[PDB]
Design a protein around this ligand. Structure first.
Ligand code: CA
Ligand code: CA
Ligand code: CA
Lengths: 269, 60, 63, 269, 269, 65
């Protein structure tokens, strides 16, 4: 049996303020529903999910969480944005789908602090935020999704990005290139071309082919289209080159979103 | 100090990570066993969530 | 396959590989050989026995 | 292999008549498609599913079966209403999804009578009813869904309902509060608040979050949102209090629908 | 990890030409995305999937592949048509859903030739065709879907079709009767009526009930509505009669599509 | 076809703390603990023992070898 709780009131919710959603340790957080009003998702900046003071996932703005859910075609409602720790799209290969989905839940056992920090923009009309938690029996943090932010400049022609962090033992579920002039992209590991120079229209067709929604000004490289976690990129230590070849038509700075995965560690990624 | 150097392995095959994944699959079955019984639900009823807790970490 | 001496030394070093111990173990293998000895020496005796030599042949006959 | 059969003609289908769909014993009924015309679903009153003369499930009107299917977002077609014994939304935890869904099928082995009784309203224009059965190999009634009806007066303020039947060994998949002025509801068992006083808007958001459709003038407490049967309320013999705290804004009569679950017994619930 | 490749250019793509998509042997083809322009799907005739020179699946026109995907409610996009070897609708009974779906992938190991032949109509405006492959690790052809074409005369009244090929050990996933005047159909094996004389409206309701889309002028007999492969017709070497009783209202020639299934054999069906 | 995995009852121990004690016998027991507190109250050594006992929210520890 799951428990639906109305989280404690968020302290000091005001424009230009730096607030935090301190989660009580002990149980597992499958989903966290954040209700907002008097402020836009884009006005909720620097969203960070921290476990024991260490960064887990980061969102430039709350709007990126809305887009993250939209991509998987999850239920979107105005005035509310959810933090889906449990991945509903997961499919089991040697275990049930339910087990594969719940494995991403935010367990808090052994944790000292679980927080969701963010800053309220100064222009916020009259910010009002509350949260509801869909919890289950306690478990260790364990397997978690680690959304990381990276900013790289793009040229008009070809741009190569090979300096992406490769935490050993971790995996890469997907890579999102946020740019308005990306025509085609190619992904390779150690010379091996896992993703040919696919045109945007072709890449976007495959995405939609798997029930995903194409995000505006974004080139998504989904490594878990089938929902199989073992299809994701395994950051094996012996890997010598993890490269991305981007064919752009504009000279701009792109925001590269990398969805990492791995067993959460006190001293890990 | 310790380090690895030079190895060989089968292509596109499941590694030791999938050996852990089975463990996560096993722990789901352990939770499902508690879910089937009402005695499992009552065991979970003694779970409070607060901001503070005892932490321990060390090598051995 | 790699011999007991090479196996025992490499097995002692549980992990890693550095210095000459790594280089020797990395580029290690078995061995074969080829050389002149009994076959060539016996053939030379046949040539020495056939001196100044006598003609022997085949190809003719009733066929 | 399944068998699709055109059930025998329904005897005496006329306005103001009391008809019954007598099902032949021997096999398993996964789904029963009831075609209707010359009558509205609301004109088909007191729908009772009886096994061996005992009541299994009850519907005030056929319209409640239409709403039951609509809630799960099942295919709805005008002129036809289906009895989904097999629950398509079920997900397996230690078994396959298919096994978890088919487990609810209406097995008839060992049964003496299997009937679907109902009354045709007098105002019925020109009632015409036929049925089709999607069957499979015979099985005992076994695990079945038992829809029960309850009526309780709801006040303007706070009302508490703790007298809901608690058949031992049985489970509760969901509870539907049919009232027009319900603002928030709270569910607890033995003091433990499994469902905080959740506002309707918040509760309805979670429902939709799991692919469910919100029913008009209804507050649904879904205990199987994930499709996992082990998330439902297990009516343990030791439970001392099963309470519902309803915050209404109107003084009205609510129809409380309780979806029970358990292994069918000739002398059980 | 899967590999997305831009297949080699299709040789001699012109109106009235006979082209072929020669697939490189070694890996497994899960999906093949065929992009087309300057030609209609109906202008791409006689589509044949050949393994080692032998016929596997056949499509009168590329439009039949579009309808095949539409029926399962797969993502349809104008200018592109995909060959879904892996069946996304598959559900596992004693194995995971993923295993049951991927089991249909087009493995090429041990093959000498893998081709997708077709003829470009003479009326084609300015045909332009390219292909992309979603591949995975190599496997033998193994379990494959074998779409077969049959033409039979339907009468206005009742027609019976019992001469359908019954390859031993193979299965039948579905049968599609392409005719404009089919009212009802009945399916039986050895006298046993597995599908009663179901009216089109009733048959189509069950289809939609399982997330399928009804095709125009088509009567589909889906034996895998649940996604369970074990629900399909097992062509037992002991079946004496496999009959189809069609009740038509027109006198026309129907195109009967039979989706067979079985482990591909160099000297098999 | 498929081979089903086992579903069974594992290590689940429900320990119901069945406390049965006579209300009058408790009233005396609660009265006896008051006398024990009174014994500590009479002596200054009893006061000094209670000064060493505060309350905190939690603990913590870290190390490496
Ligand atoms: Ca986890
Ligand atoms: Ca049953
Ligand atoms: Ca195959």
């Amino acid at each position: 049996m799951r428990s639906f709780l109305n989280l404690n009131s968020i302290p000091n919710v005001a424009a230009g303020n730096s607030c935090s959603i301190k989660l009580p340790i002990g149980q597992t957080y499958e989903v966290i529903d954040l209700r907002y009003s008097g402020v836009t998702p884009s006005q909720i900046k620097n969203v960070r999910v921290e476990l024991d003071g260490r960064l887990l996932s980061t969102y430039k703005t709350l709007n990126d969480l809305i887009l993250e859910n939209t991509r998987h075609k999850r239920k979107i409602k105005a005035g509310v944005v959810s933090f889906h720790f449990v991945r509903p799209e997961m499919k089991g290969v040697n275990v049930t789908d339910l087990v594969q989905q719940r494995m991403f839940a935010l367990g808090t056992v052994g944790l000292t602090t679980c927080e969701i920090k963010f800053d309220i923009d100064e222009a916020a009309a009259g910010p009002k935020l509350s949260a509801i938690a869909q919890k289950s029996v306690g478990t260790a943090p364990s397997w978690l999704t680690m959304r990381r932010n990276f900013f790289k400049q793009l040229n008009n022609g070809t741009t190569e990005i090979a300096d992406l962090p490769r935490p050993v033992g971790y995996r890469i579920a997907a890579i999102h290139i946020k740019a308005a002039g990306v025509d085609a992209v190619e992904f390779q590991i150690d010379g091996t071309k896992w993703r040919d120079l696919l045109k945007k229209a072709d890449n976007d067709y495959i995405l939609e082919q798997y029930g995903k929604a194409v995000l505006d000004n974004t080139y998504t490289i989904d490594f878990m289209l089938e929902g199989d976690v073992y299809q994701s990129v395994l950051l094996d230590q012996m890997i010598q080159d993890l490269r991305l070849k981007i064919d752009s038509t504009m000279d701009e700075q792109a925001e590269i979103i990398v969805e990492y995965m791995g067993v959460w560690s006190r001293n890990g990624f | 100090t310790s380090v690895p150097t030079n190895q060989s392995v089968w292509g596109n095959v499941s590694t030791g990570l999938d050996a852990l994944i089975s463990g996560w699959a096993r722990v789901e079955q352990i939770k499902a066993a508690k879910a089937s019984t009402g005695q499992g639900r009552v065991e979970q009823a003694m779970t409070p969530e607060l901001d503070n807790g005892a932490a321990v970490v060390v090598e051995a | 396959d790699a011999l007991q001496d090479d196996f025992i030394a490499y097995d002692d070093r549980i992990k890693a590989w550095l210095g000459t111990h790594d280089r020797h173990k990395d580029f290690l293998a078995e061995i074969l050989d080829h050389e002149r000895r009994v076959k060539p020496v016996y053939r030379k005796l046949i040539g020495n026995i056939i001196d100044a030599s006598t003609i022997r042949a085949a190809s003719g006959v009733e066929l």
